[PDB]
């Protein structure tokens, strides 16, 4: 079901074409090509734009169009730890399934998609804060090590959303972790038409719209 | 049992008419047509003006008028705690009842009214107040992450009140996000007459006021 209107998106066809071109392509190709080339599968994406401008709209639709297990979504900075250390336990409990699957099966495991709402809530300048407790540094470093480090990962996809790309530490943006970046500006006239239609199909279905409109 | 006069608010008839039209229109018509439309109720209202113009009393009376449960009010920044993480835990407990009730019955639950006083005390511009502990930026992120997001809620209504509407977040006042933004202004002569009559009703009824006035 790749209708793209049954799903309900505001004429963002070109956006999806470009994202599939850039990524999700090595994902549907012969592994043998990936051995001759030796190019790894991209595992980082970012979607930012006018606050809630259909920013979570497609985030709530991608979970359907995929023939793998339902992607796990993290809704905002709920990684709270009251005693000591369990913030790093929470961060750990996100990637356990990927580790287990990769150990169980390799080169054909599948994909696991993780979504961080309010990325900006938890990822800021490491040294800027002067607070006595350094929890933010602790979580930032743990996440950095998990996404990138001596240990290798090949069956994950991290997606990040912020309504203000500015308060983000540059270390997390180094090439090889979140190299890809994309913006969602505003809807064209033509896309506005499809939008109106999508937002008015039921209206016309039950004969509640005056022909003058 | 009800009456507009019973409340004892005068001079804001247009304001009440607009509020009722844009807030309570979908909650009074027979369910069949509204359900045939697939429209989501508005769940946001914001008020502001100079002190002593009857903003507090307005919310007091609007809450009292409903045949719903007693509204839960928050008196300024009263949801802060001395530890890491319980600003969010406090801003999150406010929605347990609505979520539970929606999941038990669904589509037939009563409204849940929440009132914030001086919203500007807690919710302000992210990227500002560059002090320490980043708690404010975390609270704002949670509040938005919870008013809207991956989960759906249709039995809530939030009222905010401020005096300096230029310091609130942009998305917090966007569509479906305190979208209705009203403007209470100093009364007119007719408003003055109505007000004086309202505050001089218990006197004429006991012959305690001389007819000379």
């Amino acid at each position: 079901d790749w209708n793209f209107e049954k799903m309900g998106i505001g004429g963002l066809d070109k956006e999806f074409s470009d994202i599939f071109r850039r990524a999700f392509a090595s994902r549907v190709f012969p592994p043998e090509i990936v051995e001759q080339m030796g190019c790894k599968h991209v595992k980082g994406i970012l979607l930012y734009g006018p606050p809630g401008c259909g920013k979570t709209l497609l985030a709530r639709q991608i979970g359907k169009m995929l023939n793998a297990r339902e992607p796990k979504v993290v809704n905002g900075p709920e990684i709270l730890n009251k005693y000591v250390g369990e913030s790093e336990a929470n961060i750990r409990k996100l990637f356990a399934d990927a580790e287990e699957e990769q150990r169980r099966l390799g080169a054909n495991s599948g994909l696991h998609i993780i979504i961080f709402d309010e990325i900006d809530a938890i990822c800021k300048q490491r040294g800027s804060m002067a607070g006595s407790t350094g929890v933010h540094d602790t979580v930032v470093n743990q996440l950095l090590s998990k996404i990138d480090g001596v240990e290798q990962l090949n069956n994950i996809l991290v997606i990040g959303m912020t309504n203000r790309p500015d308060l983000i530490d540059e270390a997390l943006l180094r090439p090889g972790r979140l190299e890809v970046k994309m913006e969602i500006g505003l809807p064209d006239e033509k896309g506005r038409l499809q939008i109106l239609h999508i937002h008015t199909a039921r209206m016309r279905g039950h004969q509640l719209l005056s022909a003058d409109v | 049992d009800w009456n507009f006069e019973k409340m004892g608010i005068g001079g804001l008839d247009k304001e009440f008419s607009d509020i009722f039209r844009r807030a309570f229109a979908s909650r009074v018509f027979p369910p069949e047509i509204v359900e045939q439309m697939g429209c989501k109720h508005v769940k946001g209202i914001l008020l502001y003006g100079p002190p002593g113009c009857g903003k507090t009393l307005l919310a007091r009376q609007i809450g009292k008028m409903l045949n719903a449960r007693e509204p839960k009010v928050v008196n300024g920044p009263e949801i802060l705690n001395k530890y890491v993480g319980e600003s969010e835990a406090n801003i999150r407990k406010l929605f347990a009842d609505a979520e539970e009730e929606q999941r038990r019955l669904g589509a037939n639950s009563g409204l849940h009214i929440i009132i914030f006083d001086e919203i500007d005390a807690i919710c302000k511009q992210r990227g500002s107040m560059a002090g320490s502990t980043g708690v404010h930026d975390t609270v704002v992120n949670q509040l938005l992450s919870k008013i809207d997001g991956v989960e759906q809620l249709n039995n809530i209504l939030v009222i905010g009140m401020t005096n300096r509407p230029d310091l609130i977040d942009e998305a917090l006042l966007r569509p479906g996000r305190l979208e209705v933004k009203m403007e209470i202004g100093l009364p007119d002569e007719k408003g003055r007459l109505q007000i004086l009559h309202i505050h001089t009703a218990r006197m004429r009824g006991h012959q305690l006021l001389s007819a000379d006035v």
Binding site: K82, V84, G131, S132, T133 | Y83, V84, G131, S132
Partner: peptide
Amino acid sequence: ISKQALSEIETRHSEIIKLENSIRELHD
């Protein structure tokens, strides 16, 4: 002039009172 403070908790599960009751009972 500036600065604010913070606080934190830890895993302690002492319950020395109950352990003291128990061990005293053991002694008797």
